[PDB]
RNA sequence: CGACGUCGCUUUUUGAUCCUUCGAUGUCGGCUCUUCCUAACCUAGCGCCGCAGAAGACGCUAAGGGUUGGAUUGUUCACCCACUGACAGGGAACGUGAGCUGGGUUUAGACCGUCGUGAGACAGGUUGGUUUUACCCUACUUAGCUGGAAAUUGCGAGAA
RNA sequence: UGCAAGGCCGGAAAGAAAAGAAUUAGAGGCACCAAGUGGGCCUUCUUCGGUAAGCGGAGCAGGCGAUGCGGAAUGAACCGCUUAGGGAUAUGUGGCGUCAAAACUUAUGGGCUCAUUCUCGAUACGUGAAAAGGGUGUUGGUGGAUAGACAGUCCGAAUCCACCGGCCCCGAAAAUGGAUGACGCUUAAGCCCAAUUAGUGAUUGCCCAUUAUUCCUUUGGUAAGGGCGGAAACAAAGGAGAAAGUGUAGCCCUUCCGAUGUA
RNA sequence: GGCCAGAACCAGCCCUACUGCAUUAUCCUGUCGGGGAUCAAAAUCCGGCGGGCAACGAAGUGCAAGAAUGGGUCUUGGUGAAAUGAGCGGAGUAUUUGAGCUGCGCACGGCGGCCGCACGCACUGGUUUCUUCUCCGUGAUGCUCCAUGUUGGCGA
């Protein structure tokens, strides 16, 4: 096993990162976010003068260290998405049948995929704001914002699987509802 | 075996050696077995006139009897609960001088000279010393006993 | 713990005959829960190398070569195991101990849990003490750091075998059963 | 999809054996009824294809549910006709005879062919040929009475 | 006068030396009269026929049969030990998380392993369940290499290739609900090594036998011995016995050894 | 009291505490050189040379023989109806075990007659500097068995 094994992260100006029992809190100038991690056991500590975040771990083997980097990398999301946001811009890909696509609040209503009667149904959590963009800028983008990564990108994989192609070749027939962008929103 | 002739089971037993074919020799002839000696039985293969049965062969047992051309061998024979004398008749060229008793006559003969030379006042020759004892060892060379990578080497082959 | 097996000096040779009137002696150094098992493994050499048993062969010495000052140390031990799969395998593995005898203890332990290798299949070629610059393996060469510290976590403190208690209070060292 | 090879698995075949039963464990098939298995025929979700569609091939998780009406044959099997989403394969003393039935096998009657001098024989064909008993104990189905926390006692004292 | 054979008379006899130079719970022989039995089975190792078989057939030797007891959860045969009726103390095999006695879950011992519907493993005999092949799960080893290298778009430290192990996983489908014996166990209560209160100051942690040692009692010997010529004295208001004996409540005492068992 | 308990002591037996003798050298320790790493160092490591006892409870190394002159015996009998006693009596301040030091010859080791002898054997050698119990002692005129304390409780 190896003694001590070290990650560092830097933290920008306006970033506030605090730690407490595995539980990491986030601050930035558009929101918090928080992180559960108390499923790792790892030694997490922030430096507020040096403005730098380590986490380490003592006495590992290869699996306890694979999880540095994945909590490094978790925490550099949350700087990330508390301070530019994430932006997952969605785009409308068929053949024949338009997909109609409805985002009246949080509901996102899919239409007419593949010529289907059954419409598709999605209820994007508070904390992701789902917008249409104009169709004369782009045809059939949907934009879902957020600060959290994995929520912003939860809710695109979502509306992603509404859209599968049943019972046909999937080589043909590429009909569907495809992240086409993932930017930040400034 | 299948069948419990007389010389069954007997290929390789009364057999001769390689390159020692032939009759026997003349030194078999002349030489002189008494009544009470001690003989081993071994079947000569060329013979085949006075032959032991197999399970004589490679036994020791005393002359009981001497005809113009045979001898009488007393052998003792396990059966069951007890030994028995069983006295075979085999031809004097299936008969050799036993040497079992070689080594208490000489004992016997080298006590009389014992005695011989104790009375005549000569000195005995010294008593042999114990080879168990202990004592100073002092080595001339001295090796070093290891294992090394070279032995494993070997004892690979191709 | 003191270590399981002891560093023996076994010195030996053929019985003096008339054939050999000198024999060698050998020195033979080996690690040995008892001096038994001691001459045991030197025989079984001496058997395997120079063709003399120990019916006719005499033991000069078999000693216990005494282990240096306790001082934290790398010990390189040249050391093969035979398997049926296998074959004899030789490997050469550095180890953090104190004395020889620690470390070769220790490369009996990890030959048993990592391969399987039981006392009897086991040969150790050799044990050097070596510097931490000609150490190779990062699981060794990470003890070398001067400033080389750590916390004791996830810490399994039982207590004393006469305090001990079955039962007791929850934030409380009051023992209920005990 | 796999030739030459090679490694398994399963007791839905048949053999091999002879352990149990010969003061007897009723010994074909069907009928009826329940349940179990999965090596999945249909039904639920899917992956992959020489996958355009339709129809299909192969594979995975899954045995919850379903898997038929008939002609011939004692049949198990077989075959054909017809519906169907489908007409999957098996076990339970080769499930199941004090549950039935008795067409077959396998007594005594009789006929034929072949065999035998003959009496008779033939795992060859044919026809006719008693299917006994529960009121006991369990199991199961319902149907009643009734004490019991120290599971009958201790007074032995614990409240979701 | 040599040889062979029966004797007779003498001699010498470590009574068998020294060189590792035997040991013995070593009375050797000889009969007589009879019983059961004459279906055998299992096992280590060797072995033949058979694809194999809890199949058939042999060799050496141990068992069961005829035999319990303590262990392997359970089993004629495996392990330990084999047995008069009882204590105490120690063990054997096997164990010490509970069932269940023992680490009230021992150590101030080292490593390895995560196993989602027959549910990872803990199955000596017992094959009384698993293979060929495979895994970029993890942990070891053996060779080779490349070192401002590999990757990434240059830029700062180790990277790559082949092969072989350990444990785990895939391979791995059957019929009543079910079996490391059950529950559970994962800072193991699993696997491989070690230890006995732990680098402190020496070499016996603990539990369990119809075994060992020891004590008491019984019984029988191929039993071994002692005493038995009443020593002397002694009323009631120290006592009693003392048999020349196979066997009895055994003359009496002491002392050793053995005690299971179908026909 | 031929019942139930407690304690005391005696003999036997069963457990425990109390430890000496050998060995150590691939060792211990200074210094010089190398090498290592540092921020500089020391260390880990390798040689030479000079001294040695790692001696604190030195070692977890080989053998131990240390007179319980502390527990248990509801695991055995007893209360002196024979006490055999290093233990109970009597009498003496000694006996002689070992450990130190040491004489002669031999033995052993080295060099090949000397030089060494760790202290081996014979003189059952010397010295007592430390350590120690040393002698005597009771037949059965008992063939055998059984019959003998203390303190309470319960029994009038
Ligand atoms: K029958
Ligand atoms: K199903
Ligand atoms: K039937
Ligand atoms: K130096
Ligand atoms: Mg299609
Ligand atoms: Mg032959
Ligand atoms: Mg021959
Ligand atoms: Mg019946
Ligand atoms: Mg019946
Ligand atoms: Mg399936
Ligand atoms: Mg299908
Ligand atoms: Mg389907
Ligand atoms: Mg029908
Ligand atoms: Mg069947
Ligand atoms: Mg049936
Ligand atoms: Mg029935
Ligand atoms: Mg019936
Ligand atoms: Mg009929
Ligand atoms: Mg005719
Ligand atoms: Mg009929
Ligand atoms: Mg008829
Ligand atoms: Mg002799
Ligand atoms: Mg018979
Ligand atoms: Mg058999
Ligand atoms: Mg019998
Ligand atoms: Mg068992
Ligand atoms: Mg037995
Ligand atoms: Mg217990
Ligand atoms: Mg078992
Ligand atoms: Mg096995
Ligand atoms: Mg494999
Ligand atoms: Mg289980
Ligand atoms: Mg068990
Ligand atoms: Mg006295």
Redesign the pocket.
């Known amino acids: 096993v190896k003694v001590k094994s070290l990650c560092t992260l830097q933290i920008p100006e306006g970033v506030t990162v605090d730690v407490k029992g595995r539980k990491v809190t986030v601050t930035g100038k558009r929101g918090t976010l928080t992180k559960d991690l108390t499923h790792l056991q790892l030694d997490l500590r922030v430096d507020k003068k040096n403005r730098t975040f380590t986490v380490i771990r003592w006495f590992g083997?290869?699996?306890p260290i694979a999880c540095l980097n994945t909590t490094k990398a978790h925490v550099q999301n949350m700087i990330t998405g508390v301070t530019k946001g994430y932006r997952f811009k969605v785009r409308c890909a068929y053949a024949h049948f338009p997909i109609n696509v409805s985002v009246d609040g949080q509901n996102i209503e899919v239409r007419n995929f593949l010529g289907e009667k059954r419409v598709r149904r999605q209820l994007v959590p508070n904390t992701v704001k789902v917008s249409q963009t104009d169709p004369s800028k782009v045809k059939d983008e949907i934009v879902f914002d957020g600060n959290d990564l994995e929520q912003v990108s939860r809710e695109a994989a979502v509306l992603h699987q509404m859209c599968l192609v049943?019972?046909?070749?999937?080589?043909?027939f590429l009909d569907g509802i495809y992240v086409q962008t993932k930017t930040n929103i400034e | 075996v299948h069948s419990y002739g007389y010389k069954s089971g007997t290929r390789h037993l009364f057999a001769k050696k390689f390159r020692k074919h032939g009759v026997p020799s003349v030194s078999t002839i002349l030489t002189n077995i008494?009544?009470?000696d001690y003989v081993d039985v071994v079947a000569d293969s060329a013979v085949r006139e006075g032959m032991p049965h197999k399970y004589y062969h490679g036994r020791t047992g005393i002359v009981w009897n001497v005809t113009p051309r045979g001898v009488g061998v007393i052998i003792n024979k396990p059966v069951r609960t007890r030994t028995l004398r069983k006295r075979i008749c085999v031809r004097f060229e299936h008969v050799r001088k036993s040497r079992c008793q070689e080594a208490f006559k000489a004992?016997e003969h080298?006590?009389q000279a014992?005695?011989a030379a104790k009375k005549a006042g000569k000195a005995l020759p010294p008593?042999?010393?114990?080879?168990?004892l202990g004592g100073?060892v002092?080595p001339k060379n001295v090796e070093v006993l290891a294992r090394r990578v070279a032995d494993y080497e070997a004892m690979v082959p191709y | 713990?003191?270590?399981?097996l002891?560093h023996y000096?076994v010195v030996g040779r053929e019985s003096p005959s008339e054939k050999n009137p000198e024999p060698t002696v050998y020195?033979f150094?080996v690690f040995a829960?008892?001096?038994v098992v001691a001459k045991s493994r030197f025989w079984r050499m001496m058997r395997v190398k120079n063709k003399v048993k120990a019916?006719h062969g005499d033991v000069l010495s078999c000693?216990?070569?005494?282990?240096?000052?306790?001082?934290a140390?790398?010990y390189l031990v040249d050391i093969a195991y035979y398997?049926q799969?296998?074959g004899y395998?030789?490997?050469?593995?550095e180890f953090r101990?104190?004395?020889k005898?620690?470390a070769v203890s220790?490369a009996?332990?990890?030959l048993?849990?990592?391969?399987?290798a039981?006392?009897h299949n086991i040969e150790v070629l050799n044990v050097k003490?070596?510097?931490?610059?000609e150490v190779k393996?990062l699981?060794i060469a990470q003890y070398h750091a001067?400033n080389l510290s750590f916390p004791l976590l996830?810490?399994?403190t039982?207590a004393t075998?006469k305090d001990?208690?079955?039962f007791v209070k929850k934030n409380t060292k009051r023992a209920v059963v005990?």
């Open positions: 083997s290869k699996i049943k019972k046909k070749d999937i080589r043909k | 008494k009544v009470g004992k080298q006590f014992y005695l008593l042999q010393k114990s080879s168990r100073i002092r | 713990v003191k270590p399981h002891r000096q020195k150094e829960p008892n001096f019916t000693k216990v070569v005494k282990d240096a000052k306790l001082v140390r790398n398997s799969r296998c395998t030789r490997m050469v593995k101990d104190v004395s005898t620690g220790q009996y332990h990890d048993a849990s990592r391969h399987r039981r006392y003490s070596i510097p931490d610059h393996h699981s001067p996830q810490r399994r039982k075998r001990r208690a079955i005990a």
